Amino acid sequence: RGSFVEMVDNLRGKSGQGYYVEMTVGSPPQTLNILVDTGSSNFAVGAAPHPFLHRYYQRQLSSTYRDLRKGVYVPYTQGKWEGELGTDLVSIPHGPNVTVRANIAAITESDKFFINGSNWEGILGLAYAEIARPDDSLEPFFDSLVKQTHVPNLFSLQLCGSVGGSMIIGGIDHSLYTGSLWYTPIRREWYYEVIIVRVEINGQDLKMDCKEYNYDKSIVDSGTTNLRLPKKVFEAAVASIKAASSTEKFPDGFWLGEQLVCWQAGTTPWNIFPVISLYLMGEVTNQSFRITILPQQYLRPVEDCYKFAISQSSTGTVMGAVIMEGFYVVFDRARKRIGFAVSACHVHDEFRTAAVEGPFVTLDMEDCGYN
Ligand SMILES: C[C@]1(c2cc(NC(=O)c3ccc(C#N)cn3)ccc2F)N=C(N)O[C@@H](C(F)(F)F)[C@@H]1F
Ligand code: NA
Ligand code: NA
């Protein structure tokens, strides 16, 4: 408990391609790099020689593979995968010293799913059964780990924005953050859904009915890059960010992520750009706390050309790698709560850093959830 040196620095990534962990499947073990995704619930790995893949799961080499004789077809807004379900032995070499029989979707066909040039071959969905495909009877990886071993029911993520970071399975590592953790209730176990109770742009309230902030949900999602905001909130949010920064001008397409913006090396003026404050529902009645991110988080370098990484959504708020990279994030499934602390690795400057503070008094926080 509190100290897990074998797990520190067990994630890798390339900017905008996500964070992955090394895993092994089958006997003998086949090593695969696997995207860490708290916004889905399937363990799904490349199982056929798609040209984008460095490696793929070869069921025929595994003596412990068991076929479930059942297909799965999974579309998303862009792209899709189809695969064959079964189970096999899975370990995490730089995770707990255990092996579990987990469900695995062996991906046999995909479209716009794998990234050309990336170093990962599958996805580890860490969310709950309610959104597993085909349905909630396909037990997700984390559920199997907890049922079959003594690994405690929690994990935590430190994403460092050549990306790296730490996934601590079964605990928290105190060297990964500073100050205190503050917890927000997981409103329902499907996605890691939470409730945003107030939003401030450089300490000015957007002043919306807070139901707008969670229309139709807000979730914590390591498998998305952007901070995504419901359209109505996104519109209010950039209007207020535009106003805060208008001491300089950007093309308008910029704010829709339709073009990039550039300054010449080491000239980016961060001091014009405002901080963005999200207040999350706290653990106690009428109590919230707030997390504060920097322009360093919402202006992503494209390899000095940044992309605006907040974007409108029709699926609700998505706190992607934009948010998580400032924070150490504890997915405390045993107590149905998500903890945030300042990350000991976040990208910052001389004037400002990311922040997690409380308590604040916020009344009627239950009105903020969408039904
Ligand atoms: C399974 C799924 C998903 C995630 C990624 N994710 C990255 O490719 C990436 C890229 C960069 C970063 C970063 N930083 C993280 N992930 C790619 C394909 C996917 F199919 N997971 C989530 N959460 O979002 C859904 C969606 F992508 F469709 F929106 C989708 F359900
Ligand atoms: Na257990
Ligand atoms: Na600490």
Amino acid at 265: A
Residue-wise burial string across 254-273, b where 16 or more C-beta atoms lie within 10 A, e elsewhere: bbeeeeebeeeeeebeeeeb
Torsional sign, CA 103, 109, 114, 118: positive
Question: For residue 33, which phi and psi values (nearest 5 degrees)?
Answer: -95, 135
- Catalytic residue flag (residue 205): no
For ligand 3, a single-atom ion, the residues with CB < 5 A are 174
In contact, 167 and 207? CB cutoff 8 Å:
no
CA-CA distance, 184 to 156, in Å (whole number)?
A: 14
Active-site option among 88, 143, 221, 332: 221
**Maximum CA pair distance of the chain?**
64
Going by CA atoms, what residue is nearest to atom 28 of ligand 1? 76
The one catalytic residue in 37, 88, 143, 173 is: 37
DSSP secondary structure string for all residues of 156-175: EEEEE--EEEEEEETS--GG
- State how far the Cα of 168 lies from the Cα of 214, in Å rounded to an integer: 28
Full set of structural domains in the chain with CATH: 19-151 (2.40.70.10), 152-371 (2.40.70.10)
Which residue is listed with tokens 């503050």?
182
Measured from the alpha carbon of residue 14, the closest ligand is 1
Report the b/e string of 230-247 with b at 16+ CB within 10 A. Answer: beebbebbbebbeebbee
Ligand 1, pocket-test mutation among 14, 17, 35, most atoms within 8 A of CB: 35
Q: Residue with structure tokens 């707008």? A: 212
Query: Alpha helix (H) ranges present in 278-320?
Result: 295-298
Question: What phi, psi does 174 have (nearest 5°)?
Answer: -70, -25
Which DSSP symbol is given to 284?
Answer: S
Q: Which of 34, 37, 312, 331 to mutate to test the pocket of ligand 1 (most atoms within 8 A of CB)?
A: 37
Hunting for tokens 């909630």 — which residue is that? 136
Experimental technique, in short, is: X-ray
Of all atoms in ligand 1, which is nearest to the CA of residue 161? Answer: 14
Do 48 and 56 contact (CB within 8 A), yes or no?
Answer: yes
Determine the distance from the C-alpha atom of residue 297 to the mean position of all C-alpha atoms in its chain, rounded to a whole number.
14
> Are residues 141 and 111 in contact, defined by beta-carbon separation less than 8 angstroms?
no
Resolution in Å equals 2.0
Strands (E), 112-243: 122-125, 155-160, 163-169, 177-185, 193-194, 196-201, 204-205, 218-220, 227-230
Cα(224) to ligand 1 centroid in Å equals 5
- Please name which ligand lies nearest the alpha carbon of 344: 3
